[PDB]
Design a protein around this ligand. Sequence first.
Ligand SMILES: Nc1ncnc2c1ncn2[C@@H]1O[C@H](COP(=O)(O)OP(=O)(O)O)[C@@H](O)[C@H]1O
Ligand SMILES: Nc1ncnc2c1ncn2[C@@H]1O[C@H](COP(=O)(O)OP(=O)(O)O)[C@@H](O)[C@H]1O
Ligand SMILES: [Mg+2]
Ligand SMILES: [Mg+2]
Lengths: 525, 49, 98, 540
Amino acid sequence: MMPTPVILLKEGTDSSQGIPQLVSNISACQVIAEAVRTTLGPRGMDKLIVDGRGKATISNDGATILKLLDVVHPAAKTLVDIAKSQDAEVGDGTTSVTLLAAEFLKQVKPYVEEGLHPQIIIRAFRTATQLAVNKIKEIAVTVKKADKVEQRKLLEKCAMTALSSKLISQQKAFFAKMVVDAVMMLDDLLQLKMIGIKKVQGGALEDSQLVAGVAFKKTFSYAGFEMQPKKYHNPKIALLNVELELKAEKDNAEIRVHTVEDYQAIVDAEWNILYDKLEKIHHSGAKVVLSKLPIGDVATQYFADRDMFCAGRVPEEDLKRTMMACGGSIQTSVNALSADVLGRCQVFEETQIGGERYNFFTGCPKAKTCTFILRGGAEQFMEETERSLHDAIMIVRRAIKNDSVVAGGGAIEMELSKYLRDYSRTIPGKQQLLIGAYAKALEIIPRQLCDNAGFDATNILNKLRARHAQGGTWYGVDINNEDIADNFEAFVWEPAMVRINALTAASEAACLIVSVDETIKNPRS
Amino acid sequence: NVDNIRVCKILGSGISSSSVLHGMVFKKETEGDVTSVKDAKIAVYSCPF
Amino acid sequence: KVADMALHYANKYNIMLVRLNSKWDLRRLCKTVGATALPRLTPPVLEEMGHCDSVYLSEVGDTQVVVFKHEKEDGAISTIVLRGSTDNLMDDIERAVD
Amino acid sequence: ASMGTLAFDEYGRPFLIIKDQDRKSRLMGLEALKSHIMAAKAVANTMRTSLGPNGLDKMMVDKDGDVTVTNDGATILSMMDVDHQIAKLMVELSKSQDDEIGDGTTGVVVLAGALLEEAEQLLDRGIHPIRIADGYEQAARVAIEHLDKISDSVLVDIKDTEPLIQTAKTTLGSKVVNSCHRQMAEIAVNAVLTVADMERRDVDFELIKVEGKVGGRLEDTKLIKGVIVDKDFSHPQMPKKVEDAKIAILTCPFEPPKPKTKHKLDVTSVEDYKALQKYEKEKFEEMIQQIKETGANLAICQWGFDDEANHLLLQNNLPAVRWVGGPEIELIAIATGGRIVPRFSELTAEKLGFAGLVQEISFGTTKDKMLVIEQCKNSRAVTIFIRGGNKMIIEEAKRSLHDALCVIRNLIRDNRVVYGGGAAEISCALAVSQEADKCPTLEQYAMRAFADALEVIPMALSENSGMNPIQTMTEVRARQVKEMNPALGIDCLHKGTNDMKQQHVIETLIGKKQQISLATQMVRMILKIDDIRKPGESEE
Ligand SMILES: Nc1ncnc2c1ncn2[C@@H]1O[C@H](COP(=O)(O)OP(=O)(O)O)[C@@H](O)[C@H]1O
Ligand SMILES: Nc1ncnc2c1ncn2[C@@H]1O[C@H](COP(=O)(O)OP(=O)(O)O)[C@@H](O)[C@H]1O
Ligand SMILES: [Mg+2]
Ligand SMILES: [Mg+2]
C-alpha cells in the first residue's frame, strides 16, 4: 500500500475482505447466539438489561433480549433481524432461530477455513432446508375430525407448551385455559387489539382474571362523580365521541351583539345547547355514558342528578373494545340515539383492584373481545407476564389457522437430523459433508435443553439418536425425569409452522452471511 | 411502463412465499368500521373527507 | 384528513374509508382501479366511479394491509408482495426484481 | 468476567459487536445470583429492625433536605435512593403489598430476604435455581392452604365493633401513635364503617379526607362526620357560626355572566352605557335574590366572587364561602345531602344540603381559619383531622391511620383472620415441614428452606423485643406442636402469656396470604435472572 497523492475512497474507510472477515462474521453470530443461549426451554433463565436512562428490562423472550442489545456488527444484526421476523410471523421460536443459524455457521466454519467455495455451502443449505421443510409437512400430525373438545384440548396443550418456559410456568395450565378462552372469542380476524391486557400492581399471579367483556381504568372523574351510582343491573351504554362541556361553539366563531338582552340570550343559548345534548343523551334510556372527548363537571353533575354514570377521556382502544363487547356504535352526534346504537351488558360495576379503580362490563353474550387483568408484584414482573401471554396467544391463533402439531423437546429436530443424515449418505460426497453438517447442527436444540437443565447432553443425545434410528418419531428430552421420553404422549406439542419458519429463517440468515465476502465501513458523518 | 410494477416487502415467511397480486397493497388500516367489501365501487377524492 | 362527523356518517351508511397520505399512491390507485380523483366532495358520476373485485383488510405476518384485488389477470398496475426473513434480503430481492 | 467480550479477532482485525461494548458491564452465572441475593439480604436486614411493636423507625432525608421519620416499610423503601436493580425490585414489592393490602409492607421484604438467603445455601450445594423456585412455590401453596385452615371469622357488624377495634389496635401497635392506641383505632374503625357499601362491596378512600394541622396535641385528633375546609367566610363581618344551615352548593361565580365563545358587546350610545350598567347591577341583585328565595342560610361557591356580591351577601344575612375546591365541593354535597347546582336559575329548596352546625375555627396565634361542616343528618363522607406537636409526627399519624383504614377495608372485603406475633408463621412452617417429610427427597431441601425462611418473622420479633431469638422461637414451636394451638406466638410486649388470641393480636388472613404469595413470586423472579447487562458508564 503505497500512499497515492489522491486516495480513492474517503479517508477513514475500513475494508475487510477474504476468509478472515467471514470467519469473524461467524464468530460474531456465535456471540449473538450465546447472548440468549441460556433462555431455552423449561429450565431457561431470564436476562436483565439496563438502558442508558437506568430502566431495567427483565425478559426470557429471545427477540426482546436481542432488540435490547445494541448490536452494531453488520453480520450479527442478521440474527436479530431473523429473530424479529420469527416473532412477527409466528410469535414463538425467537431463540431457536438464532441458535440454529449460529450453529449452522459454526458447523460450516471448518470448511470455510479450508477455502471451500461459499456457493456450494449455500446450495447445500438450500437443499437441506427444502428437504427438512418437506419432511416436517409430511410427518406433522393433524386431527381431521373437527371435534370441538379435541380441538380445544390441542389448543390448550400448545399453549401450555409455549408457556412452559416463562416465570408463569407454575400457573401454565391456568393461563393456557385463559388464553384459549380469550382467543376463541375473536370472530374471524383474530386481531390482537381485540384482546385487552391490563397490568395492575399488587396481588398474586392466580389473582389474574379474564373478564368476558371490557374493563378499563377510571379516567379523571370531575366533581360530583362520587354521587353517581357505581353498579347497574341491566344498563344501556351510550358510546360517544362528543365533548360535553361548556365551550366555544367553534374556534373561529365570534358573537357580535349590541344589546344586553342579546347578551343574556347568548348565555342562555350556550347553556341550552349543552342541556339539549344532555337531554338527548338522557332520553335515549342509557344509564352508562362513555366518551372519547372530555365530559365536563356540569355534565357530570347532570348525570349524577339522573342516577347515571359518565366517564370521559376513554381511550380509542378501550371504546372500540367496549363497542365490540356490548354491540353499540361510537356516535359523534347525539341527534339520533336510537335503540340499535346503544350497547348492552348484563352487569356494569366499578370496583377496587390493588389501589386503582376499574370499570367492569360483564355478562356480554355476543362479545367478540375480552380483557386480561394481570396482577404482579413488580412492573417488570407484569411486563414479562404480558410477553409470555402474547407468545401463548400468537401460538393459539396460529393453531386456529392451521392445526398441525409436532412433538417438542428436540424430538422434531432429532428426527429431521436422522432423516437428513440418511439422505446425505446417498449423494456424491461434496454435498454429503455439508448436509451432514446441517444435520449435526440440527442437534443444537436438545443439547442446549440438556445443558440448561443441568443434564449430561452427550448421553441424552446418544440415547435420542439410538431411539430415532430404531424407530419412534416423537422421542425428545424429558426435563423432569432426567431422561428421554415420547414427547407426543407427554403433550409437548408445538405447531409445525413454528419449526418450519425457524428452519427457513435460520437457513436464509446463514446463506446471507456466508454469501458476503467483503465488508466496507464508510466513515461516520 | 416500469413504474406500473409495485413491490411490497413484508417480513416473516421467506422469499419462497412471495406472490404477485393484480392490484395494490397499502400498509395501513381502515378509518371506519367496515373492513371488507366484495363488489367495490371505490370513489376517490383528492380533497379531505 | 377524515373528519369525525364524516367518519361517523360513513360508518352509519356502511362505507369503507381508506386514507392515503401520498399523492403518488392516490394516483396509482386511481390508475389501477379506474377512478378520477375528484377535487370536491360531490358524488361521483358513473364514469368517474372506480371498480375492483374485492377490497378488504388483511394481516400479513404482523403488518395490517389494505388490499385492492382484481380477479381478472389484467389491470394497469400489478404488485409483487415480497416475503423474507430480513429487511436486507428483501431489499436485494427488490433490486433483482428491478 | 465483565466488559462483555474482548477478542479483537484471531486475525488481528477489529471485533466490535455491541455499541460501547468496552464500557458496558456484564455479570453472568452463579455470581449474578450471589450478588442479587447479597443485595436483597442487605435490604431485608436493614428493614427487619422496624418489625413489631418494639420495632424502631427509619429517619429519611430527601434530596431537598426534608426529613421524614417513619416506620412504614413501603414509605422507607420509596424514600431510598438505590441503583441496584434487586433493591428496586424489593421497593416495588413493598409498593405492591401496600397497594393490594395496605399493611405488612415490612414483612414481605423480610420474608423475601430470608427466602433468598436460604436459596443461597441451597445453590451452594448444586441445586438448579428453578428447582428452588418450584419448591418454594409448592411450600407457599401448602402454607396458604394451612392459613385457610387455621383462620377465624370475625363479625364486621356496626352493632359490635370490638373485633375491628382489636384488629386496628394490632395494626397501630407498631406505630408512634400507639400513645393514643384505642382512640386512633376506634376513629379508624368508625371512619371505615361510615363510608362503606354494606353489601361487602368496596370502601372508597376518596370519601375519607385525612388532613392534619400543627399545634394542639396528638390526643386532640378527632373524627368529624362531615367536611373540614381550609377556607373561611369571605366577608370578615359575617357570623363565624351557623346553626341548622341550609347550604346552597354552587359552581357558578357570583359575577355577571360570560359566554364561553369569544364575543364582543358593542356600546354605541349613552343609552347603551346606561343599559349596560343597569344590567350589571340588576344581575348582581337578581343572583342574590335567587339565592335568598330558596331559604338557604349559607352559600358555598367554587369560583369566588367580587365585592358587590360579597356586600350583598353580608347585607342579606347569607354567610358565604368562596374558592372552595372541587373535591371539597363534592365532599360537602355528599355529606350534607345536597345537590351541586351549576347556576342560580336551577337553585331550588330541594337541592339545598343540611348541616347542623357550620363553624369557623381558630388555631391559636396563627391567624389561620378553617371551616367545620358537621352534625349532618346521614353524612356519607367523613374527615379525620389530626393534630400534633410537629409536622413529622403528623405525617406519621397520617400514614398510620391510612394503614388502619386499609386493614379495616380488608376485613370488610374478607372477614377471616389469623393471629399475629409469629403464630401464623410458626404454624405455617410446621405445616410445610410436615408436608416435606412425606415428599420426594430432592424438593425436601427447598421446602425445608422455605420453612426456615418463614421462621424469620418470630425470630425478628423476639430480637426486636430483647429476647433470645432461637430459644424463644423453639420453645413456642414446641408448645404449638405439643398442644394443638396455632395461636401461640412471640410475647413481644411481655404480658406474661404466649397465647396471642388472648392478647388480641389479630391480623387479616388475606394480608398474610398476599404476603406469602408476593414474597414467593418475587423470590422466584429474582432466582431466574442469571445475567446482568449494565451500561456501566457511571454518568453524572
Ligand atoms: N415441557 C417441556 N419439556 C421439554 N421440552 C420443552 C417443554 N416445553 C418446551 N420445550 C422446548 O423448549 C424449546 C424452546 O421453547 P421456548 O424457550 O418457550 O421458546 P423459544 O422456542 O422461543 O426458545 C422448544 O423447542 C420446546 O421443544
Ligand atoms: N402486640 C403485638 N405483640 C406481638 N407481635 C405483634 C403485635 N402487634 C403486631 N405484631 C407483629 O408485628 C409484625 C409486624 O407488624 P407491623 O410492624 O405493625 O407492620 P408490618 O407488618 O408492615 O411490619 C406483624 O407480623 C405482627 O404479627
Ligand atoms: Mg416458546
Ligand atoms: Mg403493620
